[PDB]
UniProtKB/Swiss-Prot annotation, chains A, C, D, E:
Family membership: Belongs to the YscJ lipoprotein family.
Species assigned in the record: Salmonella typhimurium (strain LT2 / SGSC1412 / ATCC 700720)
Whole-protein residues included: 20 to 203 of 252
Listed name of the protein: Lipoprotein PrgK
Subcellular location per the Swiss-Prot or TrEMBL entry: Cell outer membrane
Function in brief: Required for invasion of epithelial cells. Could be involved in protein secretion.
GO terms (BP aspect): protein secretion
GO cellular component: cell outer membrane
UniProtKB/Swiss-Prot annotation, chains B, F, G, H:
Organism: Salmonella typhimurium (strain LT2 / SGSC1412 / ATCC 700720)
Keywords, alphabetical: Cell membrane, Membrane, Transmembrane, Transmembrane helix, Virulence
Presence of the UniProt keyword Cell membrane in the record: yes
Gene that produces this protein: prgH
GO cellular component, one term: plasma membrane
Name this polypeptide is given: Protein PrgH
Keyword Zinc: no
Subcellular localization(s) per the UniProt record: Cell membrane
Function of the molecule: Required for invasion of epithelial cells.
Length: 184, 194, 184, 184, 184, 194, 194, 194
């Protein structure tokens, strides 16, 4: 009966719990209304629980996206800011697309930025793309990677097969069993 | 508190072994299960000596002792598979030990493994180890350069690599390692600009 | 029954405790509401506890990110500030990505900055990247390092395999056992 | 029963105590609420206690960081101030990173500054780096130093292996025993 | 029962006392609240006490730092003032670093200043550094001096081994014994 | 307050030894466990002489005494493994001590180790030490330059290094050191610009 | 107030000695423990003469007296190790004292050390001292220039130095000093620009 | 009010001596202890003549008297060490006094020292004094230029100096002075621009 975390939002609470269960630790999610969620554990596990909170940098931080630092609420704007805002949206939109492909469970996308080509009287640089993906276990990753790469190639003004990188894998053995209580 | 009931619902993930040293062992096939069992021992209780077994950790533990008492011994990897009778791959060509000496060696290994009933030492041909390493490597259409030297062989993979061939390369290497181990064949993947 | 630390936030409290337990010291976390958390220890351990608080620079400082010094609340902005803000976000976003790779427990990312190339009539410099990573114990680090490096290579306008450095390792033996009480 | 120090903050109080214990002096930490902490010692030790307060420049001063002298609260800014602010943040961020490396207990980082290159019509100078580090006792320092140096090399626009200096060592024998009371 | 000093702050009071004890004089520290501290001595010692107050310029003055004369509270600023402020901070930060090195009890750092190079159309001058250090008695000073010098060499844009001077020594025999009372 | 119960839940992390000097020793395999046990002795209590053992610390303690009383003795490292009978590696080629002298030497070592029942001094061939150092080094495809000199050998590794080969280099060096020690073979990794 | 109970919990950090001068001595192995014990004597109490011993401080105390009464005596360092019978290293080649004279010398040293029961004066070969100094120095791959002169030798290390070789250099020097002392071999590290 | 109890807790810092002139003397080894004792005499009380002794102050006091009554006497320094029988170093080569004259000299010195029971005048060889001065100086790798002249020798050290060699130079000089004194060998450190 120890207090581990307090004031968690919904996402954070569920993520932390997932980790604890994975490492054989039961956890309680307590709804304190406006005060958020609290996570408590059995005293026998408490030491281990703390160790894992440290190990996995828990609770999770909010996801960082470029547009979050160049808001439309500003009274004025600049070419620099506007171009950045657009690219941010594009990365998000590409992620939304890849996650609908057959066998894909999760995917992340990055695009290179251009902050001062024209500014310096220079022509724009070639666009670089990179992506991460997680597939359903047992899927033929070695071939699927070519769909991603082809799709992305014609998804942007000027890229090529040498400037697109894809790193991927598949999910682990699903934790379908409860950790269990302490012996006492 | 029977240990079988203390361990997870899918009891078939673990093989409980009864060591002659009065220690009840838990053989796990994966580090996630290794940790699972260790948490059980720390969280719950069982009035008896107990210890979780991990194939790689045991392979390492043995190799440490083995290097001290039998330095210069040329060997590959211990295949635990069936706990009771693990198989010890020994370099057929590099070792010149007599049958009697090999008997003694297996006896020392039995001492190192409280659960194992006997040890099956067998001699492997260094050539076939190298042959498989290269054959699979070139089957995958990977670029490489072989480095034969006294006591081993290294496979160098340099230059810029396509994401596809990178994936293939790692898959192959991991499997080779899992089987033979990295004491004779060494792979060297080096992603570099051209 | 000695007072060690007071007024700690949630993160700090859990981090300090983790260290004390690692060094065989039991610790109490006391919730004083709006006043924060307090950490107390048994008098027998108190001397050692103090020593370790010193040794590990505890309690922990808040994490420093570049954007924290160039806020959007300013009435005016400059090219210098805006470019810095963008890079800060990018580092954060890259860290978020690496921590989702299989076997990665924690990762940190740095990118070089450019504060006055164009300012001085000069062309921009090549981008340098560096990163730290912690893997699940037993993982084949010597090969995994190539995924990180490849991923980062095409994640930015102009980098190369000689200007990307990755330093990494794996976690230690998990502290799954309680320290225990003093003998008396 | 002598008064040694008064009005200490939490950090200072714990640091001073650590030193006194190291030199075989028991010390009391008294919480006077809003008035801070007070440190008192046994009269038999008082003379020695005073000597050590002098010797170690106690109580400790607050840590000095460059950004503390060029605050964002100013109504106006200058290139000079802004560039300084950025570098300050970068040093802090590098320190945060080195302290997460395996075996590192503490680390400090310095970066050279450039206050008037462009100002004088001159090109910027090469960047110099230096760092201090404390390792877990028994660690192979002679090899670990190369990770630090490699990491830092690609962590900044233009440095090299001759302009990066690392000085390091390891912790002392932990003071795990209480000083003891005076004989009377 | 003579009054020696009155209205002392905490630091001053403890420093003066340290000196008196070193010269075999007992001293009382009296807390008069808002009025500060007072130091009194036995009449038999009073003459000697006065002599030593003179000899050691007591009570101590507050420490002088360059930034104290160019405050951020000014409505306007100048390149001259700003550059001075920065250097002041840097010296402080270097002192903070040297005092964390193994065996160092105390250290002071000076850096040369540049008030009008660019002002006169001239290029900047080479940077000069000097430092003082006190080590734990018995330490191998003749070798330790090289760490200081190497560290400082790459801690600043442009210095060299001929323009860095280090003067150092070690602490005296600790005064661990009380002076004693007068005979009467 | 039996010491076994005073030490952590996983009692198998420590080997308690009963020294002939009436001191109960705690053998630890890692500095984290060394500290653990030391904290137990300072925190809790046990009415009897006690002292925590650390393989490297003991190796060093002995080497200090040994250098004073047996200066110029050429040796490698003490392998504690089985506390009772530690193994002392001695340079076969550089030492010319007689059998009787070696008897005496082992007796002095027994005096230095209150728990050990006997000391197994054995002579190692300097050539095989050097051979292994270089063989593994070149197996890893690392660049180096060997420095043979009277009394030892140094392996110099200079130039700019790829992060991958840096990792490999350290792993190798640490293992070599752990086994043989750094009294004969010295490695010199120097990361420099080209 | 038995002194053993007055000193710290880990009583094994100190060796209490009973001097023939009725002074109870506290042998400490480190200046932190030296200070610890001194604070005990000043803080607490013990109705009997007492004095804390420090290996380096005693080595120095003796060398002062020794220079006055035996000027020009060529010697290295006193190894206290076992308090009762400290070892005095004497230059075999530079001293021409007779056996009887050496007897007298040891007797004077016994007078200087109230606790020691006897002094083991032994003669060391200057060549081996120098040989070890240089051998280790070059083993570390350090640059240097030897300076042989009547009565001693100096090892000059100049030029700009890599942080790695700086660390190595100091480690070596400190160890050499600890063993032999700095009366014959003098090291001279000079970090300079090239 | 026994003087031993009037002086500090660590009574072993002072050597109380009973002079034949009915003055109780306090021998101190350091000016901090000299002052300590003087403050005791002024602060507290003791109904009896008393006077604090300081090795350097006494050496000077004697040299003043000695120059007046024995002008041109060539000597080095008085070594007080054991209060009772201080040693007077006298230039063997420059003095031509007869044995009887030396007897008288020692008697006058005894008169100057109320506590000392006798004075051990001994003759030292000027060559060995100079030899040691130069030998140590060059051992430290210091630059210098020797100045032999009738009645003495001066060692000139000029030019810009490295902070490291500055430290070394002073350490050496202070020690030489402490032993032999500055009446024959004079050092001249002059930090100058080149």
């Amino acid at each position: 009966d120890k207090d581990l975390l307090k004031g968690l939002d919904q996402e954070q609470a569920n993520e932390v719990i997932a980790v604890l269960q994975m490492h054989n630790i039961e956890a309680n999610k307590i709804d304190s209304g406006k005060l958020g969620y609290s996570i408590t554990v059995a005293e026998p596990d408490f030491t281990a629980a703390v160790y894992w909170i440290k190990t996995y940098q828990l609770p999770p931080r909010p996801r960082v996206e470029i547009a979050q630092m160049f808001p439309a609420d500003s009274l004025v704007s600049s070419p620099r800011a506007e171009k950045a805002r657009l690219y941010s949206a594009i990365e998000q939109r590409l992620e939304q697309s890849l996650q609908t492909m057959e066998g894909v469970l999760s995917a992340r996308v990055h695009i290179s930025y251009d902050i001062d080509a024209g500014e310096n009287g220079r022509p724009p640089k070639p666009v670089h793309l990179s992506a991460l993906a997680v597939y359903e276990r047992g899927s033929p990753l070695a071939h699927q990677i070519s769909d991603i790469k082809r799709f992305l190639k014609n998804s942007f003004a000027d890229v090529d097969y040498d400037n697109i990188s894809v790193v991927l894998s598949e999910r682990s053995d699903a934790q379908l069993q409860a950790p269990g209580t302490p012996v006492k | 508190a029977e240990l079988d009931s203390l361990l997870g619902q899918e009891k078939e993930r673990f093989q409980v072994l009864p060591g002659r040293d009065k220690m009840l062992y838990v053989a796990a096939q994966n580090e996630r299960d290794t940790l699972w069992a260790r948490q059980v021992l720390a969280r719950g209780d069982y009035d008896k000596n107990a210890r979780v077994i991990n194939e790689n950790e045991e392979n390492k533990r043995i190799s440490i002792w083995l290097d001290t008492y039998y330095p210069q011994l040329a060997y590959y990897r211990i295949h635990f598979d069936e706990p009771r009778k693990p198989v010890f791959w020994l370099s057929r060509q590099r070792n010149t030990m007599s049958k009697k000496e090999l008997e003694v060696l297996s006896q020392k290994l039995r001492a190192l493994m409280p659960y194992a009933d006997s040890v099956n030492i067998t001699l492997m041909d260094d050539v076939t180890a190298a042959g498989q390493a290269e054959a699979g490597l070139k089957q995958q259409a990977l670029p490489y350069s072989r480095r034969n030297h006294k006591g081993g062989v290294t496979f160098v993979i340099q230059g810029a690599l396509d994401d596809v061939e990178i994936l293939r390369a790692r898959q192959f290497v991991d499997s080779y390692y899992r089987t033979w181990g990295g004491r004779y064949v060494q792979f060297a993947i080096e992603l570099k600009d051209d």
